[PDB]
Amino acid sequence: DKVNDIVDQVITIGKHVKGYHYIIANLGFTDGDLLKIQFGGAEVSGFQIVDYDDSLVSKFIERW
Amino acid sequence: DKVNDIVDQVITIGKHVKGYHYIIANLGFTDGDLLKIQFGGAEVSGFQIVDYDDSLVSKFIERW
Numbered sequence: 001d002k003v004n005d006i007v008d009q010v011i012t013i014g015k016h017v018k019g020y021h022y023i024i025a026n027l028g029f030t031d032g033d034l035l036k037i038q039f040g041g042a043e044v045s046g047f048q049i050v051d052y053d054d055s056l057v058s059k060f061i062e063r064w
Numbered sequence: 065d066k067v068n069d070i071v072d073q074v075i076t077i078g079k080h081v082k083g084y085h086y087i088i089a090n091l092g093f094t095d096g097d098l099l100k101i102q103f104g105g106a107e108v109s110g111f112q113i114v115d116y117d118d119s120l121v122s123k124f125i126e127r128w
Contacts, residue, residue, distance in 0.1 A: 014104060017078055040078055 007037050016040035071101050080104035 003024060010016045018041035024032070029046030037044055051057055067088060074080045082105035088096070093110030101108055115121055 012103065014078075014081055017081065039076060 003032050007032070010042075011036055011040065016042045018042060021045070067096050071096070074106075075100055075104065080106045082106060085109070 003026070007016075010020075010022075016037045020042035022037070022042060022044045024044070024046035027047055027049040029048045030050075030052075034044065052061065067090070071080075074084075074086075080101045084106035086101070086106060086108045088108070088110035091111055091113040093112045094114075094116075098108065116125065
């Protein structure tokens with residue numbers, strides 16, 4: 001939650017363009033909305049614990 | 065309406081930063097939302113037919 005608030009502020013002040021580099025320090029990188037700071041230009045990195053490429057997880061989502 | 069759609073797209077692609085100059089070709093410059101491309105950096109100009117500085121208009125708004 002606190003991440004989306006910051007990300008929103010970042011876009012407002014325009015500090016999401018090429019030159020900036022953000023690192024989301026949590027296990028849910030794809031858990032938040034990234035479509036906003038995705039085309040900004042600034043590189044964004046993070047961590048993902050739930051690999052949606054695993055057939056195990058992929059099957060879970062199919063029912064979820 | 066078509067202006068807000070464009071303005072929104074402009075902010076998304078980030079073409080609202082310093083260096084760009086937009087001119088809203090209508091008689092309602094303050095009729096649309098400008099708070100979005102206001103802090104972007106790009107200069108925005110337009111036209112206003114309803115002068116809210118006139119005591120005549122100012123009185124109208126007081127009741128409106």
